[PDB]
Amino acid sequence: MLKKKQLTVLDLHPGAGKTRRVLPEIVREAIKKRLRTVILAPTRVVAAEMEEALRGLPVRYMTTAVNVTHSGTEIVDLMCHATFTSRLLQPIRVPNYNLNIMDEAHFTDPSSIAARGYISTRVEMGEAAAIFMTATPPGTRDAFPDSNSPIMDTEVEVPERAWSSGFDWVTDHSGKTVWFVPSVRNGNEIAACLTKAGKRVIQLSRKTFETEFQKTKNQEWDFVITTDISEMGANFKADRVIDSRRCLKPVILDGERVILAGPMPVTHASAAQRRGRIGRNPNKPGDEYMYGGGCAETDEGHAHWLEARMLLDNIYLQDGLIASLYRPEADKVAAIEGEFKLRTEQRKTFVELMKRGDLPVWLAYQVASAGITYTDRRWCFDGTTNNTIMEDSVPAEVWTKYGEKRVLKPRWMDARVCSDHAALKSFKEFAAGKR
Numbered sequence: 001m002l003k004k005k006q007l008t009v010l011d012l013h014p015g016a017g018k019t020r021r022v023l024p025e026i027v028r029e030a031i032k033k034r035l036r037t038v039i040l041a042p043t044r045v046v047a048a049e050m051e052e053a054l055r056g057l058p059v060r061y062m063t064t065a066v067n068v069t070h071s072g073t074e075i076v077d078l079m080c081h082a083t084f085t086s087r088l089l090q091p092i093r094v095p096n097y098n099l100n101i102m103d104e105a106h107f108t109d110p111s112s113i114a115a116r117g118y119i120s121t122r123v124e125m126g127e128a129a130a131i132f133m134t135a136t137p138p139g140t141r142d143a144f145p146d147s148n149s150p151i152m153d154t155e156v157e158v159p160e161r162a163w164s165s166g167f168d169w170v171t172d173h174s175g176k177t178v179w180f181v182p183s184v185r186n187g188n189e190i191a192a193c194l195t196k197a198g199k200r201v202i203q204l205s206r207k208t209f210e211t212e213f214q215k216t217k218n219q220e221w222d223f224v225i226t227t228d229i230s231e232m233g234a235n236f237k238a239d240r241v242i243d244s245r246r247c248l249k250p251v252i253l254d255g256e257r258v259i260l261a262g263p264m265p266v267t268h269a270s271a272a273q274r275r276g277r278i279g280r281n282p283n284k285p286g287d288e289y290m291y292g293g294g295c296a297e298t299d300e301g302h303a304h305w306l307e308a309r310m311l312l313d314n315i316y317l318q319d320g321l322i323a324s325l326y327r328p329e330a331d332k333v334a335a336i337e338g339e340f341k342l343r344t345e346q347r348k349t350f351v352e353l354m355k356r357g358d359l360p361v362w363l364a365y366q367v368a369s370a371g372i373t374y375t376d377r378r379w380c381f382d383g384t385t386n387n388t389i390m391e392d393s394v395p396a397e398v399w400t401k402y403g404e405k406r407v408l409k410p411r412w413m414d415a416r417v418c419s420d421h422a423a424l425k426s427f428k429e430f431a432a433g434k435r
């Protein structure tokens, strides 16, 4: 695996020990061979788990999720996917790693797709080796891969709203269930229904995942309601998955706005990862997977792949060369390489709108490319009428940095800024000049 110009897809089935058994073997070998190595975790939670698997090996943890005193001498770095791409974007020197290891390498967030693109391009250039660890590489068509123990698969109608009758099987179960919903809002409704029926429910989503995931260890629970973020290496001591088989797809319409389309079917890779939360313990056969729809290749035209191009157009590789997306996932977007390359000052604005601004990549790009500076929030208020953001069926309002109450009506409307209460709260703070 370790030879220059090699990219290896380590596609052992879910729970086959890629992270806890194989990875430390790869790391030991890398250190013996004096290969400057990076290890890329999808989440802080995974980073912390990796620390436990690698304990006693000389690894620099470039994350506050791990409390360790480094020697200074480590030639192996560990950071999150997002942190890697973030450092590439910024005017900070990122070592040209000889070996690049991506765990949970199916992650479809823009920064992860961009990271794969950059790393695979380095490998194709002859510069580096890489190892992508995932049970579900890009374009997999198998939603039902092998497991540590047999799984009972059943196609069944799964509720997506509060119910009073007709789904007794949901609540009659005495074990622990992980339930994949397509959005925070939808999970909130199902969670409230389960709570009303006497169940203990934890909810997980991107923004809450570190904090809330700990509750799954510290408290007793009957249900975990989660979005697709729990596809990325989240482990639960569960005996059932309920899978709506549904997700939201950000879609750019007319180059002009972003909508959250669907809910619509998940990919085969996502379904397999959802399912792969269970069947993990060879001493507990008969874990259940209840699934409420089919799969489809809904990554096609999904905005994350275009956003990944926006990231990659703005990462230095060599002169004017631009990294390509990783070949198996490169046709998911119709983009011209370099179309999104920004001049130095607009690039810095772009970066800052993502990093400090916490805006979606697409939105950050619209603002930066328009020649707007990071602190200039006039664009949050001067959109067309149909860009009015609504909060409880009334237009959302903030007090501007000038102290004037105005309706939130962004010049570029990206649905992700108001997909749930928390998101809209954050966008309100942004529009007000509060970060």
Ligand SMILES: Cn1cc(C(N)=O)c(C(F)F)n1
Pocket: 125, 318
């Ligand atoms: C990516 N790449 C750039 C060069 C070069 N230095 O101009 C070469 C090699 F064939 F010399 N590969």
